[PDB]
Symmetry: D2
Subunit: 205 residues, 4 copies
């Protein structure tokens, strides 16, 4: 008996494909260092949890909250980065405005893409500390719900899909933007994979 392990997905493009918005130096360590670290961290914790389940680690030889909380940290660390990479694309394929159903929903709920961009940027910059900014598609209400995560595992909304995702941990921009997170946020719009976003949304319509 055991749990299936996680696997680092391949990057959808070269590490420099996002320049000049996000330097290849950032992407390189962000993917090969940070993301890989989450896959590894999640897997080692799964191996440890398997031992708890099998009884190879008996009472007093583990602290369950440390394992469980470490798992939500690493698993989300992996899942969110995997979404992050696929949510971006080199300028041209990336950037611009959304079309199809996504654009329609955005207009109905925010008036226009231009307004949405403002509100999202504003909400992303209001995030106290490290975390993420995402646009959910609530399959229950049909609302494109904006949300900011603190760390990788706090503030998520249960079961619904992430359509737009922006990494706000400092390692996602520091080497290039230093402490100017807001400039990184502005630059990020230029590599958003709107087509992938529309494609994902379609799956829930």
């Amino acid at each position: 008996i055991q749990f299936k392990k996680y696997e680092l997905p391949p990057l959808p493009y070269k590490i420099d494909a996002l320049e000049p918005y996000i330097s290849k130096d950032i992407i390189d360590v962000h993917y090969n260092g940070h993301h890989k670290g989450f896959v590894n961290g999640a897997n080692s914790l799964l191996e440890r949890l398997e031992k708890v389940v099998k009884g190879d680690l008996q009472t007093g030889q583990y602290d369950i909250q440390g394992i469980i909380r470490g798992l939500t940290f690493n698993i989300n660390g992996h899942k969110l980065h995997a979404l992050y990479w696929e949510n971006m694309a080199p300028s041209g394929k990336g950037g611009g405005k959304p079309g199809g159903a996504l654009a329609d929903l955005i207009n109905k709920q925010y008036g226009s893409f231009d307004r949405f961009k403002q509100v999202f940027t504003e909400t992303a910059n209001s995030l106290p500390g490290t975390g993420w900014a995402v646009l959910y598609y609530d399959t229950e209400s049909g609302n494109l719900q904006i949300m900011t995560f603190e760390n990788h595992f706090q503030n998520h909304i249960a079961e619904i899909p992430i359509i737009l995702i922006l990494d706000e941990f400092e390692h996602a921009y520091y080497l290039q933007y230093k402490n100017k997170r807001a400039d990184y946020v502005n630059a990020w719009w230029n590599v958003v994979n709107w087509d992938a976003a529309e494609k994902k949304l379609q799956k829930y319509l």
Copy 2:
């Protein structure tokens, strides 16, 4: 322009259907008081967010983190309780053991339902403070991942479905069990809607 509002789902059974495991007094206020409060809280915050989007509330007339964080609190409060009600059933329909694919997965990953129950109960009782204990079906790895939430919005794992959900806020058991949360957890197994659980799991296989 606006967001669609949330609606309190009807209870799947009478308020006393879960006795003697969970008194009708608890269920009554838990549903009509607590759950309804989340729907209302979420909706009023949505109305407020609409005003921010439309500009009826201008700069300096709102604190976005208060709205956004209040939304994750109330929206999850609503969604999780909605899952909670459907995840239980009067003794007979509720309780017992799971069958089908769910039982198979449980045996492959935990050895047996008996072991799973132990590990879940142990993990649920380790929760520091109020929150939830859930069993996820990770569509990525195929793992039935156990997790404890702190409050309604901390520790969730992105996008994956909740198969089993246990409410651990004090209002879910205090009136009947006082501070003996562990006794409430033991009693809860008797009303778990395993059929609904198998049904939900099937949807992702």
Copy 3:
């Protein structure tokens, strides 16, 4: 080598001394059940941490984040309740308005005690989930800073003293007020130990 253990302080009054604002039934289990549970939880975790330090628990036989986070949960659980009991007093000795330096500071920063009461009550009721509402005396700025804690260990401000403390976990009022936390908050003002508060403030002036 070892760490000193914590001790449950004696209650400053009889368990019914706070009626009719907080029933003796609540106080009884709140002190003998909940508070005692924190002292015990903190001590057992300290014993476990001692074993990690001494090496009796070797690598792979513990998950440090579980121990450390369990310690902040239980230690604060103990400390905050200890402050809570001393921050209240039977009607007469408790309730009313503050005098001395505390009253003056309140007037300078909030205009009046009445205004302060309003803002504090408003802030306490805005707390999403379980936790606490406190009035700090920031020794750095001299500000009587209001704050809400989520659970027992989130949102504290480093090193400064708590002058006013209100428990907002459901077990502090459920048996008597059920889900009407706001009514409990209003009733609480009637047992606030303003003299003890003035006394504590004096120590930092």
Copy 4:
């Protein structure tokens, strides 16, 4: 009526005084960028809270949880960095081992400074995400309690003094160590201001 504003304390040394353990480039932006940002953020929120108190911002023109939570974030951001700067010193004045009462307490509770260093380093590296690692002096138990903070405001222990403090946000080491936080932690021991630590501890004995 109003609240007193916070002030950025002057750096205790030149921005390059901590090299080669922490580059002057990091210190420069860490102090002039990050720390200053917290003082400013705290003050603007205080100004806003004053308006809520005075009534210049009426109902519906603010979201109290956003103000209150933003205050704990920024105030701690300021206080913790202020402690951080004073807790370090150029090599010579900094680094080495503690003496006096601090050393004795460390020996009684951890066996030796060497063991303490190991446990602290281990605990600091276990921190999931950004935050801090601190050594508290619990005035209640007399325990030198280790703790890791998540972000600037989560996991603190009420009212007790911080003797040792290590910043674990990525901006404290990224420019020099990139994602190798553990190497930064090892290097940090070389600039710990043990004398200041002993001095602060003395105040509570």
